[PDB]
């Protein structure tokens, strides 16, 4: 059902940029090669600075730069919070979860930190 959606996307994109290819005078073979390659790819001190008396209150830089975990790109409708309790109302939505790709139009949501 969803690979079909990507196929839908392939048809829409190829169709709509075809005219761009023609406008440049680029060959339709290049368009097909693009599609085929793309498909193949698809699968004092204490009054100044007692500040050093709190050294190491730090955490892992591990969780952002590496991106070892999975990623989700979407949109938000409204975000809401109550102390350490957070609520999310999200919309639109492409997910990538341990090997597979998923999709949503709306997603609602609660998390604590």
């Amino acid at each position: 059902t969803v690979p079909k959606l990507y196929r839908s996307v392939i048809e829409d994109v190829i169709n709509d940029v075809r005219d761009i290819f023609l406008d440049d005078g680029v060959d339709e073979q290049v368009l097909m090669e693009l599609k085929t390659l793309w498909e193949n790819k698809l699968m004092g001190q204490v009054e100044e600075e007692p500040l050093n008396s709190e050294d190491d209150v730090s955490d892992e830089e591990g969780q952002e730069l590496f991106d070892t975990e999975n990623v989700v790109v979407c949109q938000y409708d409204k975000i809401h919070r109550s102390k350490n309790k957070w609520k999310f109302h999200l919309k639109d939505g492409i997910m990538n979860l341990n090997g597979r790709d998923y999709i949503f139009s709306k997603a609602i949501g609660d998390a604590e930190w």
């Binding site: 009054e47 100044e48 600075e49 007692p50 500040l51 050093n52 008396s53 709190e54 050294d55 209150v57 730090s58 955490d59 952002e64 350490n84 930190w113």
Partner: protein
């Protein structure tokens, strides 16, 4: 008053309000970009919002270099959180400085464990008390001594705010408690 020391139920501190100046200008955007567990909406408000779970607190820092810290259970813990944030700013590489830290407000609360008649309290202290049960369900008492505001409820619950020193809360509460006991149900 020894005679009534079961007044001495020592009201619990729940919130502390302090401010501090970091002593340098900063760029909130870069800060919001760089910092973790932080939020910044310049289209809604100016200050950047940061939040730690340590002594469970939150701070709001401006661009002038001034910031406000809240959420502390105590003033020491508040100086700790204030120092923790300034440390984080130090860790950003910015010229962070612990300058002009000061408490602005203290909040306390407690329960007296008995029901009371607000109708009497508002009658006898008409010059200071203000009660609007149609609007707010509590009763607002404005003392002129330790210039404190009190919130009184039929359950017997009390909240006090406007405080600069914990002693002032105890003093406000030791003073008013006998009156409240004098209006018990």
């Amino acid at each position: 008053t020894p005679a009534s020391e079961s007044s001495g139920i020592v009201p619990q501190l729940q919130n502390i309000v302090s401010t501090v100046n970091l002593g340098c200008k900063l760029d909130l955007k870069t800060i919001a970009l760089r910092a973790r567990n932080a939020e910044y909406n310049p289209k809604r408000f100016a200050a950047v919002i940061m939040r730690i779970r340590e002594p469970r607190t939150t701070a709001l820092i401006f661009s002038s270099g001034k910031m406000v810290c809240t959420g502390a259970k105590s003033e020491e813990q508040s100086r700790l959180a204030a120092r923790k944030y300034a440390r984080v700013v130090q860790k950003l590489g910015f010229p962070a400085k612990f300058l002009d830290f000061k408490i602005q407000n203290m909040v306390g609360s407690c329960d007296v464990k008995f029901p009371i008649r607000l109708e009497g309290l508002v009658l006898t202290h008409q010059q200071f008390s203000s009660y609007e049960p149609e609007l707010f369900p509590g009763l607002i008492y404005r003392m002129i001594k330790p210039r404190i505001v009190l919130l009184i409820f039929v359950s017997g619950k009390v909240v006090l705010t406007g405080a600069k020193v914990r002693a002032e809360i105890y003093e406000a509460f030791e003073n008013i408690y006998p009156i409240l006991k004098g209006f018990r149900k």
